[PDB]
Amino acid sequence: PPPNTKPINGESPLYQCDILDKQLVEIKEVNLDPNPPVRGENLTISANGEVFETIEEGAYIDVEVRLGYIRLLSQTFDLCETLEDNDIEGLSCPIEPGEYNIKKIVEIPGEVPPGKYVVVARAYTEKDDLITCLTGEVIFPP
């Protein structure tokens, strides 16, 4: 497989990246209701993970979406803000250490062109400490 990448257990194409760098959160298991997500349908995300350090306000995520060799999306979102805007139940921003189980539902735009997309997200705390690194490949049939 790719360098510094671990498959995540479960029905998901997700990998953990930058493993040689200490990460504050362990992503134990990830499941998606359609194993390949389907355009124009709901996608259900089940996640099981651990948090080892109190995540406080100021964490941020560098998210990059890429189609082929074209860089489609690159920006930084405020982590707490995003979890609160998307109304994740139980992810109140001061994230205490512990065992977490998260279920979140998102809708896939049907308008999305068919093709092979690569997503890369790196989340860091206010102190710029690496929380996690995740990468994935999704292929949409035409």
Ligand X SMILES: *[C@@H]1O[C@H](CO)[C@@H](O)[C@H](O)[C@H]1NC(C)=O
Q: Rule CB under 6 A: which residues touch ligand X?
A: 42, 105, 107
CB closer to ligand X, 102 vs 130:
102
CB closer to ligand X, 11 vs 56:
11
Distance CA 44, CA 32 (A): 6
Minimal distance in Å, beta carbon 39 to ligand X? 14
CB closer to ligand X, 83 vs 133:
83
Minimal distance in Å, beta carbon 33 to ligand X? 10
Give residue number: closest CB to ligand X. 42
Minimal distance in Å, beta carbon 47 to ligand X? 17
CB closer to ligand X, 42 vs 75:
42
Minimal distance in Å, beta carbon 85 to ligand X? 14
